[PDB]
C-alpha cells in the first residue's frame, strides 16, 4: 500500500490517521521531502496514470485509488468504521460533508485576504456549535452510534489542523473539546501524533 | 512615522519598499513579535480608530491612513514616483491594478485547493506575458516614462513574493527578468532585501 501526496497534511492526513488507527502498514511517499516538489509531482503524473491529475493517490497493488473523500469512504466500509446501519452510515457521511465545508473555509482564509478575523470570530464558532449539538444528541464520546467512525476522526483532524494556525477556541464547547481529547488519547492515534 | 501590520510581507511589503527606495526612516511595528499576534491586533483595534478594522495602517503624526493601495498612491504623489504626466500617472495606476489582480490570485492558491499547478501553468505565464508586452511598448528598465514609478516596485514586489513559494519562470520573459534584477540592484533596494 502506497500513499502519494506532498510532504504536508492537507487532504491526506485523514487517510494517514485511518491507517494509523487501524494499524495497517503502508509506504508514505511525500513529494518534495528533499527534491523540488513540483518536479517530483510532474514526474509522478507521467509514470502514473491518474484520473484527475491530482493527489492524494492511494495505490493498493496495481490498483490506483484517487480522491481523498472517496478513498476514506472506501477504507471505512472495508474496515468497519463507517457505522453499523443504513441510517448511521448516512449520519457519518453527513457530518463528514459538514467537515469539508468548514475545513475548506479554513484553508481559504489567510493574512493577505484579511479573512482571518471573520473566520475566527464568526464561521468557526458557528460551526463548532453545530458539532456540539450533534454530540449532544448522540450523548465515551462518538458522533455516530456507540462506536468510533471516520466522522470522529475527521472532526478531530479538523480542529487539530485549525489549532496549528489559531489559538484553541474549544473552551466554550465542552463536549467537542472532550471528544477531541478522547480520540487523541487513543493509544494508536496517540503514537502517530507524537511521531509527526 | 509608524507602519502597523503583522510580522509578514502580505500587503505591507510594498509600502516598506517605497520607504526603502526613498530612504525614509519609520518604525516597522509588527504584530506578533511579542505575544499572540491576534492579541496585539485586538488591542490595536481598541487604541486606534481604524476605518475598516484592517491593517496595514500608516500613522503620520496624528493622522491614520488605512488602505494599502490608497496609501501607496498617496506616498507616490507626495514623493514624485507616480509619473510625470496625466497619461503616465494613469498607466502606473493601471499596471498597479493588474498587479493586484494576480497578486490576489497568487495568495489564493494553496495545496488544499489544488490550485497550484493551474496557477503555474495557466495564470502566471499569461500575466507575465502582459507585463512583457507592456515593458516592450516602453522599450529593459521602466514601465512608465524614463523614470522609476511605484508600478515598477509593485511588479518587482509581486515576483519576489511569488518566488518564495514557486520556482522562477522569468526565463522566457527577458525584459521582465531584466527589469526585476535592475531594481533588485538599486542600492537602497539591495540593502533592504539583504536585511529582510
Q: What are the E-state strand segments in chain B?
A: 2-6, 27-31, 57-60, 63-65
The resolution of the experimental structure, rounded to one decimal in Å, is 2.7
Could you tell me which residues are beta bridge partners of residue A58?
A3, A65
**Are A111 and B6 in contact (CB < 8 Å)?**
yes
The answer to whether residues A2 and A27 touch, using CB atoms and an 8 Å cutoff, is yes
The answer to whether residues B3 and B151 touch, using CB atoms and an 8 Å cutoff, is no
Burial class of residue A81 in the structure, from the number of CB atoms within 10 Å of its CB (0-12 exposed, 13-18 middle, 19+ buried): buried
| Helix B150-162 with B13-21: angle, nearest 10 deg | 130
Taking residue A196's Cβ as centre, other Cβ atoms within 10 Å add up to: 7
Distance (Å) of CA A6 to CA A15, A114, A165, B39: 13, 27, 19, 33
CA dihedral B108, B124, A9, A130 (to 10 degrees): 20
CATH code of the domain occupying A82-196: 1.20.1050.10
How many angstroms separate the CA atoms of A52 and A116, rounded? 31
How many angstroms separate the CA atoms of B102 and B128, rounded? 10
B3-27 per-residue burial string, b: 16 or more CB within 10 A, e: under 16: bbbbeebbbbbbbbbbbbbeeeeee
The three three-digit cell numbers of residue A107, written as one number: 484553508
B-contacting residues in A 104-123 (Cβ below 8 Å): 104, 107-108, 110-114, 116-117, 120
The answer to whether residues A6 and A32 touch, using CB atoms and an 8 Å cutoff, is yes
C-alpha neighbours within 13 Å on the C-beta side of residue B89: 11
How many angstroms separate the CA atoms of A59 and A56, rounded? 10
Distance (Å) of CA B120 to CA A49, A108, A181, B113: 21, 19, 40, 14
The answer to whether residues B19 and B26 touch, using CB atoms and an 8 Å cutoff, is yes
Q: Decide whether A1-81 matches A82-196 in CATH topology.
A: no
Q: Which residues contact A70 (CB under 8 A, 6 or more apart)?
A: none
B90-114 per-residue burial string, b: 16 or more CB within 10 A, e: under 16: ebbbebbebbeebbeebbebbbbee
How many angstroms separate the CA atoms of A151 and B63, rounded? 52
In chain B, DSSP finds a helix count (H) and a strand count (E) of 9, 4
Indicate the DSSP class of residue B35: S
Q: Which of A169, A113, A32 is nearest to B8 (CA)?
A: A113
How many angstroms separate the CA atoms of A152 and A4, rounded? 24
Experimental method: X-ray
The answer to whether residues A150 and A72 touch, using CB atoms and an 8 Å cutoff, is yes
φ/ψ (deg, to 5) at A4: -110, 130
Residue of A8, A10, A112 lying closest to B11 (CB–CB): A112
Nearest CA in chain A to B13: A112
B168-181 per-residue burial string, b: 16 or more CB within 10 A, e: under 16: ebbeebebbbebbe
The three three-digit cell numbers of residue B53, written as one number: 478594522
Residues in chain B closer than 8 A to A8 (CB atoms) = 111
Residues in chain B closer than 8 A to A53 (CB atoms) = 117
- N- to C-terminal Cα distance for chain A? 20
| Annotated domain spans of chain A | 1-81, 82-196
DSSP calls for chain A: -EEEEESS-TTTHHHHHHHHHHT---EEEEETSSS-HHHHHHHHHHHS--SSS-S-EEEETTEEEE-HHHHHHHHHHHTT-S-SSHHHHHHHHHHHHHHHHHHHHHHT--GGGT-HHHIIIIIHHHHHHHHHHHHHHH----SSTTS--HHHHHHHHHHHHHTTTS--GGGG-HHHHHHHHHHHHSHHHHHHHHT-
Could you tell me which residues are beta bridge partners of residue B4?
B29, B57
For B151, the enclosing helix (H) or strand (E) is: helix B150-162
Residues in chain B closer than 8 A to A120 (CB atoms) = 38
How many angstroms separate the CA atoms of A21 and B11, rounded? 42
**Are A10 and B167 in contact (CB < 8 Å)?**
no
The answer to whether residues B38 and A120 touch, using CB atoms and an 8 Å cutoff, is yes
Q: Which of A59, A66, A46 is nearest to A2 (CA)?
A: A59
**Measured between CB atoms, does B191 come within 8 Å of chain A?**
no
Could you tell me how far CA B145 lies from the centroid of its own chain? 20
Distance (Å) of CA A139 to CA A131, B14, B83: 12, 53, 67
Tell me: domain A1-81, CATH 1.10.1740.10, correct?
no
Say whether B50 counts as a known binding-site residue: no
**Are B10 and A111 in contact (CB < 8 Å)?**
yes
Q: What is the CA radius of gyration of chain B?
A: 17
**Are B107 and A112 in contact (CB < 8 Å)?**
yes
Angle at A124 between CA B29 and CA A128, to 5 degrees: 145
Q: After what residue numbers is chain B broken, C–N > 2.5 angstroms? A: 139
* Coil vs helix vs strand at B2: strand
How many angstroms separate the CA atoms of B178 and B143, rounded? 12
Q: Which of B42, B132, B10 is nearest to A114 (CA)?
A: B10
**Measured between CB atoms, does A184 come within 8 Å of chain B?**
no
Residues in chain B closer than 8 A to A11 (CB atoms) = 112
Bond into B115 cis (ω within 30): no
Nearest CA in chain B to A55: B114
B61: left (phi over 0), alpha (psi -120 to 50) or beta: left
φ/ψ (deg, to 5) at A3: -110, 125
The answer to whether residues B144 and B92 touch, using CB atoms and an 8 Å cutoff, is yes
Which of B112, B166, B168 best tests the A interface by mutation, with the highest count of A CBs <10 A? B112
Q: Which residues contact B161 (CB under 8 A, 6 or more apart)?
A: B9, B13, B103, B106
Taking residue A133's Cβ as centre, other Cβ atoms within 10 Å add up to: 12
**Are A36 and B167 in contact (CB < 8 Å)?**
yes
DSSP calls for B57-74: EEEETTEEE--HHHHHHH
User: How, if at all, do strands B2-6 and B27-31 pair?
Assistant: parallel
Residue recorded with cell 515576483: B159
Residues in chain A closer than 8 A to B54 (CB atoms) = 114
Amino acid at each position: 500500500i502506497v500513499l502519494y501526496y506532498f510532504d504536508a497534511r492537507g487532504k491526506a492526513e485523514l487517510i494517514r490517521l485511518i491507517f494509523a488507527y487501524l494499524g495497517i502498514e503502508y509506504t508514505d511517499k511525500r513529494f518534495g521531502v528533499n527534491g523540488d516538489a513540483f518536479v517530483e509531482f510532474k514526474n509522478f503524473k507521467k509514470e502514473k496514470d491518474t484520473p484527475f491529475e491530482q493527489v492524494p493517490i492511494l495505490q493498493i497493488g496495481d490498483l490506483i485509488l484517487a480522491q481523498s473523500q472517496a478513498i476514506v469512504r472506501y477504507l471505512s466500509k472495508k474496515y468497519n468504521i463507517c457505522g453499523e446501519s443504513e441510517l448511521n452510515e448516512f449520519y457519518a457521511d453527513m457530518i463528514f460533508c459538514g467537515v469539508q465545508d468548514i475545513h475548506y473555509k479554513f484553508n481559504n482564509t489567510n493574512l493577505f485576504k484579511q479573512n482571518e478575523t471573520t473566520f475566527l470570530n464568526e464561521d468557526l464558532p458557528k460551526w463548532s456549535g453545530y458539532f456540539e449539538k450533534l454530540l449532544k444528541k448522540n450523548h465515551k464520546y462518538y458522533f455516530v452510534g456507540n462506536n468510533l467512525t471516520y466522522a470522529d476522526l475527521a472532526v478531530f483532524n479538523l480542529y487539530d489542523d485549525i489549532e496549528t494556525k489559531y489559538p484553541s477556541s474549544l473552551k466554550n464547547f465542552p463536549l467537542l473539546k472532550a471528544h477531541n481529547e478522547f480520540i487523541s488519547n487513543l493509544p494508536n492515534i496517540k503514537n502517530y501524533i507524537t511521531n509527526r
